[PDB]
Structure formats: C-alpha cells, structure tokens
Amino acid sequence: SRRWFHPNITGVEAENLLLTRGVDGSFLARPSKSNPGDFTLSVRRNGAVTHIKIQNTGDYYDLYGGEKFATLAELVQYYMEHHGQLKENGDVIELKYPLNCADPTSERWFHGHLSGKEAEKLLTEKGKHGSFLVRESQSHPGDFVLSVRTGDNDGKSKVTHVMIRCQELKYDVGGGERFDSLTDLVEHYKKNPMVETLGTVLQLKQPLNTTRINAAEIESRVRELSKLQGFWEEFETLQQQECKLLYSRKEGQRQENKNKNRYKNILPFDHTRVVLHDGDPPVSDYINANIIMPEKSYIATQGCLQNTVNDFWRMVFQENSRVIVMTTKEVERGKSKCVKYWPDEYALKEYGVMRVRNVKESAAHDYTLRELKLSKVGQGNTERTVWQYHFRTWPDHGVPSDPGGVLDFLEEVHHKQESIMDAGPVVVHCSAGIGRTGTFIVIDILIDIIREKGVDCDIDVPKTIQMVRSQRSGMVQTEAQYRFIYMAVQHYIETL
C-alpha cells in the first residue's frame, strides 16, 4: 500500500492529522504547497510534528537528512525496514505508523465530477467485462455511483449502476458493511463481489481505461490535461501504482557491489539487471543497469564511476550495443554526474580487456556525436563501431522548454540504430539512470509506435511508463518530465 501519501493536504492539515489521529512514529508524505515539485515527509515524534523536505528536480528523490531514492515507496520501505538512519541536531526520526489517506482523488477508478451519461458512454465505447468506475452523484450531493460493465450492441453485455451512500462520514452500498473511505468499499467489493438477484456477479476486475488515446487526437488530450491541472491528477494516479513495483534489488545490495552504485539506494531490479559474463577469474557479474524491453530494446544505466568504466565497456561489448545515448554533461552544478569513459578524439585507450578508439567527433547544436571503435584486447576481428550521442543542452533542473531539440536527436539515434544489422539494445544513461534516461526511453517507445502503426494508432502514456518502471525503479521521475513526454509526442505528430 501507498496510503501514507496524501495528495491534497496542506502542512497545517497534516500537523492536525498527526496530532489528533496519529501517535509517536506516525507519518505521511504529501506534495509541497510552499514549492510545487517538492514533497514533504511529516512525522510525529515526542508529541510534536517534524516536516522533512524531499526534493526532485528530475534525477531522484532527495530527502533532507536522509538518502537519495528512485521512488517515494522505496524511500518509505527503506526507513520502515532500516531504523536509526533518518536524522534530524542528529536526533533519530522513526517512521513507524503510516497515517492512511481516505482521499480517492489518485485512484485509477475514481472520476469525481463526471456525469452518468459520460460514464455510460465511456463504459460502452472503452469498457470490457468487469470494467468499473466511481463518480460523484449529481442528483444527491455527497453520494457516489459505482458503474460496472459485465458481459462478453446485441445485449450480450450491460452496465449496472450501484448507489454509494455517504451517511455520517461512512460509505455503504445500501446494506451490510459501512466503510471509512471509497477505497475500503471498492477493495471489499473487489474481493467479495455483489451478486444480482438473478445471478449476475458484479466483478470489479479492472478500472476503466480513460488514458489510452488515438495518436491523431494528442493535441485534444493535451488541451484537456492543461485545464485545472489534469496532468498532475493523471501523474499522481500513476505514482500511486508504484507500490506494485517493489521488486527485489538484492544483487545491488551485496557488499562487493556497493561501491559499483552511484547512489546506494538506487539499484537495478534483480529480474532485469544486466548480468556480466566476461568474468576475470570474486564478483565480476554486476553493473547498475537494466534491460528495458517495450511490451528495439534499451539498456538504462547510471553514469559511470571511475571504478565501473571497465564494467560499462564489458556490458556494451557483451550486449552488442552500437549506440549510446548520454543525456547529461560530465559535470553539472560542480558535481560529477558521469566520468569520461571515452578517449579524446583520435586517441586509443584500453579499459581493462576492452580497447576503444575515438575515430571522430561531430558537434551539432544540442549534441555531440562520437564515433568509437570498440574491440576486445588480443582479438582484432571483434571490432565494431559504437556511436555515442551526447546530448549536452538538457537544463540542470527541470526539462527543456521546447521538445524540438530532443526529437531531432532521437530521430537521428533511431536512424543510426535502424541502419545497423543485428545491433543490440541502445544504451541510455544520465546520472542515476532513471529520470532523463526514462524520459528519453519513453518518448522513443511512443514515437516508435507512431512510426510503425501510423497516426491512427493507440498510445497510452501512463501504461507505457508503468511497463518501463516494472523493469527499472522510478523510470520518469517528475510531473515536468511527464508533461514533456506528452509535449514531445504532440510535436512529433504535428511535424508528420
């Protein structure tokens, strides 16, 4: 569960919630009201409430007096499973009891102010057996309507509406149990379905999809998402689903692999990590990288450390990658983001058993292309060209104001990859390998659908992102990037 996240509470409401309904060790997370784009962890300790800032400019969640994390769920799990780690003066803050949110605003199935006719239209056109939604009742204010489609324009399927009464701060379907929130009600009737008098089982199988759009209508959806904004509601609804992606990251936590990570808590999932087989004959199989498969593949990786440069080249070699996309400068804000893992132009360098020649560098407005020759030492016939695309104009914080630059870059990367017979996955990296990396990969995936299937294809931005996030933690870090993905897709369709 991710019930500890409250999307619409102020710091004052948070303070009162913890003092009146919480105990020492109670906590919640919320979006920052003082500075949008930031978050706050509000914790009760010794009868008083502490507010801890969580910053995210696009690379990771940075907790004050704490560590750097790929998601808020990974952050919460870490402190709930590793005590004495979160520090104030040096005092230890304990996250013991998540204070649960009753607000349905970020539920996939909740549609708030939506009319019964619009809901029946959506369920008829986009629905399937067990598709459901919850909307606010217009006739009886304060009440709700649960609409479910069941079946297989021939009457083989139908929509059933169930009234949800809100009586004295609790929710019920006219009889039986009375629930503290719409979520508890939905969860209960998902496990224990209501059976109609003549036998129809009202299965709440899956929330109705309202995010899948036809590509040609992107501008229309972007316009709707810009109204009071829709982008934030959709992004936060996708964020709520991150609790389902807490997969094991054991290999990255091993003592011998600790120093191979740029950020100690930003780790590759064990089930998709790139396993290195060269093996100098103790632990030579690890790199902080994951294979990203749509549904052309990618490897999403962090910026090299001085001690991981040789592992990076072994990975590029093993996977037969011919294209690298670097989305960061080596130094940003005086901080090292990626070490220079390539030789100077015309120079030849050995990185362990791998040999790399920088043949030629070409400078474009937004990027530099480096033509590299990679081979294994003592094996001349293993030589292959590796094209390194280094995007250099991405801002220090946030995203570019126009996606034109990124799109032209991605179009070039795509054409290079397509021209090379049996090229392995495209390697993509930034600093932590999750924010800018995930942003570039998601745009690439979406535009690839528009290339193949044309402008009448179906695209679903949150579905694509959830799919990439199941293969590497926190792929696409912020709301700014989420909106940038929609803007990029919109610009592409418009220039077609």
Ligand SMILES: CC1(CN)CCN(c2ncc(Sc3cccnc3C(F)(F)F)c(=O)[nH]2)CC1
């Ligand atoms: C009005 C809303 C108020 N909450 C906001 C917008 N909206 C919505 N936004 C995001 C998601 S997530 C999603 C989407 C598609 C496929 N898979 C997922 C997964 F994988 F993440 F589960 C969703 O289901 N619906 C409908 C409800």
